[PDB]
Short mmCIF file of C-alpha atoms in Angstrom, two decimals:
data_model
loop_
_atom_site.label_atom_id
_atom_site.label_comp_id
_atom_site.label_asym_id
_atom_site.label_seq_id
_atom_site.Cartn_x
_atom_site.Cartn_y
_atom_site.Cartn_z
CA UNK N 205 16.35 2.04 93.78
CA UNK N 206 19.49 1.73 91.57
CA UNK N 207 20.44 1.93 87.88
CA UNK N 208 23.96 0.47 87.77
CA UNK N 209 26.46 2.61 85.84
CA UNK N 210 24.28 5.70 86.24
CA UNK N 211 23.43 7.89 89.22
CA UNK N 212 20.71 10.32 90.40
CA UNK N 213 18.07 7.84 89.21
CA UNK N 214 14.46 7.73 90.33
CA UNK N 215 10.92 7.20 89.28
CA UNK N 216 9.21 10.56 89.69
CA UNK N 217 6.29 8.66 91.23
CA UNK N 218 8.58 7.71 94.16
CA UNK N 219 8.05 11.31 95.26
CA UNK N 220 4.87 12.46 93.50
CA UNK N 221 2.70 9.72 94.80
CA UNK N 222 -0.35 10.81 92.75
CA UNK N 223 1.52 9.58 89.67
CA UNK N 224 1.26 6.05 88.41
CA UNK N 225 4.60 4.30 88.92
CA UNK N 226 6.66 3.21 85.93
CA UNK N 227 5.77 6.07 83.57
CA UNK N 228 8.36 8.82 84.08
CA UNK N 229 11.87 8.18 85.23
CA UNK N 230 14.91 10.42 85.41
CA UNK N 231 18.64 10.00 85.81
CA UNK N 232 22.14 11.01 84.95
CA UNK N 233 23.54 10.09 81.60
CA UNK N 234 23.53 6.46 80.61
CA UNK N 235 26.92 6.41 78.80
CA UNK N 236 28.38 3.95 81.37
CA UNK N 237 25.34 1.85 82.02
CA UNK N 238 26.50 -1.73 82.60
CA UNK N 239 24.82 -5.12 82.07
CA UNK N 240 22.91 -4.80 85.34
CA UNK N 241 21.82 -1.29 84.32
CA UNK N 242 20.55 -2.46 80.94
CA UNK N 243 18.61 -5.22 82.69
CA UNK N 244 17.16 -2.74 85.14
CA UNK N 245 15.80 -0.69 82.20
CA UNK N 246 14.19 -3.78 80.63
CA UNK N 247 12.72 -4.84 83.97
CA UNK N 248 11.16 -1.40 84.50
CA UNK N 249 9.65 -1.49 81.01
CA UNK N 250 11.25 1.71 79.77
CA UNK N 251 10.86 1.95 75.97
CA UNK N 252 12.05 5.46 75.33
CA UNK N 253 14.87 7.67 76.53
CA UNK N 254 15.04 11.39 76.13
CA UNK N 255 18.74 12.35 75.91
CA UNK N 256 18.94 16.11 76.56
CA UNK N 257 22.73 16.28 76.39
CA UNK N 258 24.39 18.72 74.00
CA UNK N 259 25.93 17.10 70.95
CA UNK N 260 29.42 17.95 72.37
CA UNK N 261 28.52 16.00 75.51
CA UNK N 262 27.26 13.08 73.48
CA UNK N 263 30.38 13.17 71.29
CA UNK N 264 32.71 12.95 74.30
CA UNK N 265 30.82 10.79 76.72
CA UNK N 266 29.31 8.56 74.05
CA UNK N 267 25.76 7.27 73.43
CA UNK N 268 23.61 5.83 76.15
CA UNK N 269 24.48 2.16 76.49
CA UNK N 270 20.90 1.01 76.46
CA UNK N 271 19.55 -2.43 75.73
CA UNK N 272 17.83 -3.21 72.46
CA UNK N 273 14.16 -2.37 72.30
CA UNK N 274 14.77 1.16 73.72
CA UNK N 275 14.51 4.14 71.42
CA UNK N 276 16.93 6.91 72.44
CA UNK N 277 15.70 10.29 71.27
CA UNK N 278 18.49 12.87 70.90
CA UNK N 279 17.08 16.15 72.15
CA UNK N 280 20.08 18.43 72.66
CA UNK N 281 19.64 21.11 75.27
CA UNK N 282 22.61 23.48 75.72
CA UNK N 283 24.70 22.56 78.76
CA UNK N 284 25.56 24.72 81.78
CA UNK N 285 29.20 25.37 80.79
CA UNK N 286 30.80 28.67 79.59
CA UNK N 287 34.06 32.09 100.84
CA UNK N 288 31.77 33.44 98.11
CA UNK N 289 30.16 30.52 96.36
CA UNK N 290 27.28 32.94 96.20
CA UNK N 291 29.05 33.24 92.85
CA UNK N 292 28.01 29.67 92.03
CA UNK N 293 24.46 30.49 93.12
CA UNK N 294 24.35 33.57 90.85
CA UNK N 295 25.82 31.67 87.93
CA UNK N 296 23.42 28.73 88.26
CA UNK N 297 20.40 30.96 88.74
CA UNK N 298 21.32 32.81 85.53
CA UNK N 299 21.73 29.54 83.63
CA UNK N 300 18.17 28.47 84.68
CA UNK N 301 16.86 31.90 83.85
CA UNK N 302 17.88 31.25 80.21
CA UNK N 303 16.53 27.65 80.01
CA UNK N 304 13.10 28.43 78.52
CA UNK N 305 14.53 30.26 75.47
CA UNK N 306 17.53 28.00 74.86
CA UNK N 307 17.63 26.45 71.42
CA UNK N 308 16.25 22.94 71.87
CA UNK N 309 14.40 23.44 75.20
CA UNK N 310 10.94 23.58 73.60
CA UNK N 311 11.86 20.70 71.28
CA UNK N 312 12.89 18.54 74.24
CA UNK N 313 9.73 19.34 76.22
CA UNK N 314 7.57 18.71 73.15
CA UNK N 315 9.05 15.28 72.59
CA UNK N 316 8.94 14.21 76.24
CA UNK N 317 5.26 15.21 76.54
CA UNK N 318 4.34 13.64 73.23
CA UNK N 319 5.92 10.31 74.29
CA UNK N 320 4.26 10.32 77.68
CA UNK N 321 0.85 11.16 76.23
CA UNK N 322 1.27 8.15 73.89
CA UNK N 323 1.62 5.88 76.92
CA UNK N 324 5.35 5.27 76.53
CA UNK N 325 7.39 4.83 79.74
CA UNK N 326 10.14 7.37 79.36
CA UNK N 327 13.45 8.01 81.10
CA UNK N 328 14.65 11.58 80.75
CA UNK N 329 18.32 12.48 81.40
CA UNK N 330 20.98 14.97 80.64
CA UNK N 331 24.52 14.80 82.09
CA UNK N 332 24.03 15.13 85.88
CA UNK N 333 20.25 14.63 85.63
CA UNK N 334 19.59 17.62 87.90
CA UNK N 335 19.30 20.90 85.94
CA UNK N 336 18.12 20.46 82.35
CA UNK N 337 16.35 17.27 83.40
CA UNK N 338 14.97 18.96 86.50
CA UNK N 339 13.52 21.77 84.32
CA UNK N 340 11.82 19.46 81.84
CA UNK N 341 10.43 17.17 84.56
CA UNK N 342 9.10 20.09 86.56
CA UNK N 343 7.15 21.45 83.57
CA UNK N 344 5.73 17.99 82.83
CA UNK N 345 4.52 17.69 86.43
CA UNK N 346 3.05 21.18 86.46
CA UNK N 347 1.28 20.47 83.13
CA UNK N 348 -0.57 17.51 84.70
CA UNK N 349 -1.63 19.65 87.66
CA UNK N 350 0.80 18.83 90.49
CA UNK N 351 1.42 21.36 93.23
CA UNK N 352 4.70 23.23 93.44
CA UNK N 353 5.69 21.59 96.70
CA UNK N 354 5.52 18.10 95.19
CA UNK N 355 7.46 19.19 92.06
CA UNK N 356 10.13 20.82 94.23
CA UNK N 357 10.36 17.72 96.47
CA UNK N 358 11.33 15.62 93.49
CA UNK N 359 13.58 18.29 92.02
CA UNK N 360 15.52 18.61 95.27
CA UNK N 361 16.15 14.83 95.42
CA UNK N 362 19.16 15.56 93.19
CA UNK N 363 20.91 16.90 96.28
CA UNK N 364 21.07 13.37 97.63
CA UNK N 365 23.28 12.43 94.64
CA UNK N 366 25.87 15.17 95.14
CA UNK N 367 28.47 12.83 96.74
CA UNK N 368 28.04 10.36 93.85
CA UNK N 369 28.37 13.14 91.26
CA UNK N 370 31.53 14.37 92.98
CA UNK N 371 32.99 10.82 92.84
CA UNK N 372 32.00 10.51 89.19
CA UNK N 373 33.70 13.82 88.35
CA UNK N 374 36.92 12.77 90.09
CA UNK N 375 36.90 9.54 88.09
CA UNK N 376 36.30 11.46 84.83
CA UNK N 377 39.25 13.72 85.62
CA UNK N 378 41.44 10.65 86.25
CA UNK N 379 40.34 9.35 82.85
CA UNK N 380 40.72 12.73 81.07
CA UNK N 381 43.36 11.38 78.65
CA UNK N 382 41.17 8.41 77.71
CA UNK N 383 37.87 10.39 77.40
CA UNK N 384 37.46 14.13 76.97
CA UNK N 385 35.76 15.90 79.79
CA UNK N 386 32.20 17.05 79.42
CA UNK N 387 32.18 20.87 79.43
CA UNK N 388 30.16 21.03 82.64
CA UNK N 389 32.93 19.20 84.49
CA UNK N 390 35.31 22.04 83.61
CA UNK N 391 32.89 24.71 84.79
CA UNK N 392 31.96 22.82 87.95
CA UNK N 393 35.67 22.31 88.71
CA UNK N 394 36.32 26.06 88.31
CA UNK N 395 33.45 26.70 90.72
CA UNK N 396 35.50 24.66 93.21
CA UNK N 397 33.04 21.75 93.04
CA UNK N 398 30.62 23.79 95.17
CA UNK N 399 27.40 22.22 96.52
CA UNK N 400 25.86 25.19 94.67
CA UNK N 401 27.03 23.83 91.27
CA UNK N 402 26.87 20.11 92.10
CA UNK N 403 23.45 20.34 93.77
CA UNK N 404 20.22 22.24 93.15
CA UNK N 405 18.12 24.81 94.97
CA UNK N 406 14.44 25.81 94.66
CA UNK N 407 15.59 29.34 93.60
CA UNK N 408 17.14 27.95 90.40
CA UNK N 409 13.93 26.25 89.22
CA UNK N 410 11.89 29.32 90.29
CA UNK N 411 14.07 31.57 88.09
CA UNK N 412 13.33 29.44 85.01
CA UNK N 413 9.66 29.36 85.85
CA UNK N 414 9.49 33.13 86.30
CA UNK N 415 11.10 33.59 82.87
CA UNK N 416 8.37 31.44 81.30
CA UNK N 417 5.70 33.81 82.70
CA UNK N 418 7.67 36.91 81.68
CA UNK N 419 8.36 35.70 78.16
CA UNK N 420 5.33 33.56 77.21
CA UNK N 421 2.77 34.91 79.67
CA UNK N 422 2.12 31.59 81.37
CA UNK N 423 3.09 27.91 81.26
CA UNK N 424 0.11 27.33 78.96
CA UNK N 425 1.48 29.89 76.55
CA UNK N 426 4.89 28.20 76.66
CA UNK N 427 3.36 24.78 76.03
CA UNK N 428 1.31 26.15 73.15
CA UNK N 429 4.39 27.82 71.64
CA UNK N 430 6.16 24.44 72.01
CA UNK N 431 3.56 22.70 69.86
CA UNK N 432 1.84 21.03 72.81
CA UNK N 433 -1.96 21.00 72.52
CA UNK N 434 -4.48 20.81 75.38
CA UNK N 435 -5.58 17.46 73.84
CA UNK N 436 -2.03 16.19 74.34
CA UNK N 437 -1.86 17.55 77.90
CA UNK N 438 -5.17 15.87 78.69
CA UNK N 439 -3.95 12.52 77.38
CA UNK N 440 -0.73 12.92 79.34
CA UNK N 441 -2.72 13.62 82.53
CA UNK N 442 -4.77 10.47 81.96
CA UNK N 443 -1.64 8.36 81.40
CA UNK N 444 0.31 9.76 84.36
CA UNK N 445 -2.36 10.20 87.08
#
């Protein structure tokens, strides 16, 4: 259930029940993991972490406080930083729209898939664990043949963490003279900590997915361009399903 010191944590198999449990996990950043959190990671058998945070985010928030025996792979993916909170919806949709072509997006997907295909239990995270992470996870799941509704079910679970993210942001702001704020905090604060910026919606993920088809022709063409072979996909399907 819990990963103490982090939030928005789950095994993807908790939702996508055709997956083997213990293979693909997701969460918020791990920069405040505590002793109980480190023990949870060891207990679950996670050997690899994919840290999708931008290097600014990593600089400010610090490295994931993981136990020994876990390889943290730095895979920077540009962050989402610069009553109508239809403005938040527009902004977020446009951010997702640009995900596929961001510098580092293909690199992150390539490494996550490569690790999974090798039989490594992997935890993928960014800052809030909902947008960048939600994109990468969704493509992984689609690559192994899961239906959209199952992918979206797991993606939307990040809405359950919105109160916890809000509390975390307030605490970061209180500590802003001790630790510089991650750039997304500033943008989310401007957006008046909307549920539209703190949460997720199926329209966001669908915008990114549409851009893959428009730019690369298909998901297969995106995966190929990202150095991911069908052999690797096949191995990943065998490991995950």
